[PDB]
Amino acid sequence: APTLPASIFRAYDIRGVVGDTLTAETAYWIGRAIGSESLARGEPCVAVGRDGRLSGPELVKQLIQGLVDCGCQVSDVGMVPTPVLYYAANVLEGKSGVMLTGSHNPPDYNGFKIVVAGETLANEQIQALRERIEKNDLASGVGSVEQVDILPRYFKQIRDDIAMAKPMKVVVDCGNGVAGVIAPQLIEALGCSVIPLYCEVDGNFPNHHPDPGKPENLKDLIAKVKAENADLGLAFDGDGDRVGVVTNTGTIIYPDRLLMLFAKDVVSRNPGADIIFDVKCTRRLIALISGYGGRPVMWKTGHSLIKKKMKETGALLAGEMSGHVFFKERWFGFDDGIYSAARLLEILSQDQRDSEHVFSAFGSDISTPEINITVTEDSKFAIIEALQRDAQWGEGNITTLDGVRVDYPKGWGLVRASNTTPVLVLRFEADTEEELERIKTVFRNQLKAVDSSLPVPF
Template sequence: MKFGRKKAQESPADADDVKPKKKFKKKNNNGNGGNKLKKLSSVALSQALVILLAGVAITALLHFVVLTPSATSSFDQARAQQADSAQQSLNRHFSEQQAQVQAIASQPYVIESMRNGADPAALANELEAALPGVSDVFIFPRREIPRTGQNDTLLGFAGLELARRAEQGRSLLPDAFPRNSRWYLQFAAPIQQSEGGAVLGSLLAVYPANQLRPLLTLGHTDMNGRLALVQTISGNAQTVVSAGNGSGTTETRRLINPDWSVAYQPAGSPEPAVSLVMVAAVVAIPIVLAVIVVWVLVGGAQRGLRQDLAGLIQWAHKVFGGEKVKQPDFRWDMVASTGEVFHRLSQVVEKRVAKASEQARPKPAPTKKAQASEEEDPLFQDSDVPDIDMLDGDEDVLGFGSGGSKSSSDPLFDEDIPDVLENALPEVSIAQEMFRAYDIRGIVGENLSAEVVEVIGRAIGSEAGDRGVTALCIGYDGRHSSPELADALARGVMATGCNVIHVGAVPTPVLYFATHHLQTGSGVMVTGSHNPANYNGLKIMLGGETLSGEAIQKLYQRTQNADFNAGQGAQSREDVRRAYLDRIVGDIAVAAPLKVVVDAGNGIAGELAPMLVEELGCEVTPLYCEVDGNFPNHHPDPGQPANLKDLIAKVKETGADIGLAFDGDGDRLGVVTNTGKIIWPDRLLMLLARDVVSRNPGADVLYDVKCSRRLAGVISEAGGRPVMWKTGHSLMKAKMKETGALLAGEMSGHIFFGERWYGFDDALYTAARLLEILGIEDRHSDEIFADFPEDISTPELNVEVTESEKFAIIKRLGEQGDFGDGNISTIDGIRVDYADGWGLCRASNTTPVLVLRFEAETEEALERIKGVFRDQLQKAAPDVVPDF
């Protein structure tokens, strides 16, 4: 130890040999004592802070847990009482005013005047004096209510409709309307000879809305605020008249007219009966006293500790100086323990000093030993510290690659544009069964090949030329056969003199968009849609018309008769994907950043769908978005529940707000809510229809025969006109043009927007419109769709039949079937509506199956309707197995 090394350097007889020891010890004690005092001060400060924080916490608990909830409850009760009082007052006033108008209309003088054919205008002027505060009075003889208010500013469509309701004896509710920045109320009553007698006409009285202001005065004198009469039509709320000012939470009550409500908004927020300052004072006083007491006690402890330490230091000086002094009594245990250690240490030092004095001076072994001990202490050796060298030469430690350049080719155009050669027309057999109701579709390797498509391309190009079309767009989906077929199609089209614009591998709606964006109005999409990987086909648009029916059959006749034009068309390519995304993002704004799972089923929508959702400001979780024409994960058909299992699981796993599923070519949409509930397209159409019709009252909304019977009621209730039509994207688009409908949809998932879009079926745009609606709601998607009625239903059910027999079976079913008391519709197949449900059986236009769907109010009714269809189908086609 240091003390021993100091002794070895001096003479053993030196009388001052303990002074360095004494000085060193003093310094060491001072340092330790300082640390002890510092820790004790920290403890005292910490205790004081804990008490203060406890006081703050108690104050906050009293204020926010006890006083504030109590004040809020009282405030809410008073607010509700004020709203109830205003509701009663206004309802009573409206009832009295309606009774007053009815009393005037029932006066014998009025009845006699109407019976005698008196001038309605003159009679109305006379009656104005009998109705205090009235702005205008109108008298209409029976069946002489005009269609418009003509030049009278206070007579509009709503007032005329109210007068008609009075004349027809229907229920009468007051109405409100604005004119020249002022609001008016109008009441109507029938003029009839006696109660239940003949109606002679109707009376309409118009009052200024500001006459209600006295009724909007506050009955609760302790609460100021604002009372307002609000009229809500189609979700649009407008204030008719109000009084006062308010900024608090609004309390609303419905009035006699279900479109009217009274809204009360307090002037401020609830305040506790006891102020926060008073609570803090009550709590702070004892806390401050407690802090003072703790500080005094800790201060006394510090003084006692200092005294003990001072005594310990004085005693240690004497002991290490060679004096024989008794250890003093200490009050603190830790000081007494330290004194005991010093006492034992002084005895050891005394023995070592005595022994050193006896040894010869030239033998400072302890010093060398001590020095060697210190110098050889492995604690101070660095021999074991390893050398660490950085390794050079590895330029890709993190595995990001060597940074070498990659091919910059765009996968959109993986295939070279086909050369146009003067080839002879291939001799191939073309099956008529591929030419279906609204597209051309076949099985690759069986009835569909590049040679077949080239001939069909000549037919399409010739038909385009005859229609005055000079150029058309060609796109294709992600199937392995699609690029080759698209090349063959282009060769055939160009051989007729029609130009071709290649838009590459894109979803079908992007091809449709290209026909608008590039102003060709014409295009052909090579796609198998939602069918298996070995299927493929053509969707054709010429001059803005998507071909169907006879136009498709005309193409077949051209192939059989070699009715082709001859020429040499040119070709080019255009990438419209960016323009497509920009057009949608420029049209749609999603107010809230939703979490969305996108399942493209390895179809061609896998590239653009996640990109679109992300650019709309949402968080995207992609699922099966790698384009793979084998569809390795599940069939690309969102109309089948089995294909949505993985999407449902991923939505639940990630806590997403919504799940979106796309078919193989991106024109059909499937939807899953945040709880994993499948929303079938007819229920999705309910939400979309309500949104579109809210801005376009009276608009037509089309839906196909497979949709729910509840859909028509939702559309009508929203103010639209429901129109049922045939299934098929071509047929639906043609019907939209015919009717001017702004929205259409099919149970298969094809949704067509005429509002703000081009009228073609587009699952990506539909998904964006859905996100736009969900983004402005403060509810989960599950709760939003719960607003709409829902019966027990099946998805689309398929019964396999032969291609040649499917339409014949439907014909026999319609001629021979006995469906009881149901209402039969033959728009497309056989749809039978019963009082408690409906059933449908139709021939698919794309695959050799019969498509069935059932819906009913109860499981029993559903099974009954299914049983009827099973029995009739077996009668019409005994060989068919109806396994539904």
């Protein structure tokens, strides 16, 4: 084996630019590393899927050949959403699965999301794959390939379990990503009228990029929902493990508010169930889960990390601010925007109120938008650490799982380091304006105690 760039081996995935940091050869040796790791955990059987990127149909050939050259039995599910690959890794013979995807990123990117013997890899497990390649610590064998058509089965699984009470009219925006293969069709079959936006699978991404996380990528959805007097809008990211939600009046429903509703529902049938959310999610969600008789568990951001935490705690539901929603009740416990969409429509169809009122009934607190402060790559983590070390927070309940979150009786604030950019990311909330200013002040003062030069835009 040759020398691969370490920079493509990231915290919860592998991601690079095709023809650049990610070549055909690279993808082969990754298959080889993944195949050897799966065999070491006693799993020869591996499912493989591709998203709808331009480099997909050719580049998976190297991944599959990598796996085959280990002795693995590969089940090739073709072009499918990311959660449909996770699904195959749950219902097929093997518990290993590789998804060739570049998520919500620009066309030239691709990469791998990896499940080995039930375990979604992260951090050190991913570095171990690179290390296997470098060390030439690789299995050798004459493997196997089998074509598997899994989408009709996934489709039937969801349709059979979802019970919609009334018809709804829904705008669906796939952003020309791979969710277009199943989302509009599934939602139609649930008993809805679907208004398709950008559901043709096109790896050029000729319209907006399939990233519901940037509000500008939601404009067309909002305009269409309003103009068609639709009951809801849904936006999927490129690979389908993420969903964005807008109401009949075009209100963006952030994932923590979405979680409030799902938690009410899941906990109602499951007294005492654990429910996971990340450090960026509103305090109201803590209260709400507890009030309904569930056990709230705050965890780290990162799909691989939430999914691990779910197995460790038995949690029936998890979600995070980026829009990954993980159902275990009635499901398999992986993040799936398409299944979450269905679960949302099921609940909404059972309410006589419009979606705007279902979500607004949870009420509000005084909230800031997410605040970004560009720092440097050199100082990024050291500022968080200086805070974790020296900052004075008074009587706050301090969480240092991921940056520094402080929960006070009447509100909270968070500051964390961006993992991919030289940026500090902050959020604040409180039940009054006067309290929000007090918490902002506490964070402003503690940052200025670190570096009196830091630009604090609040």
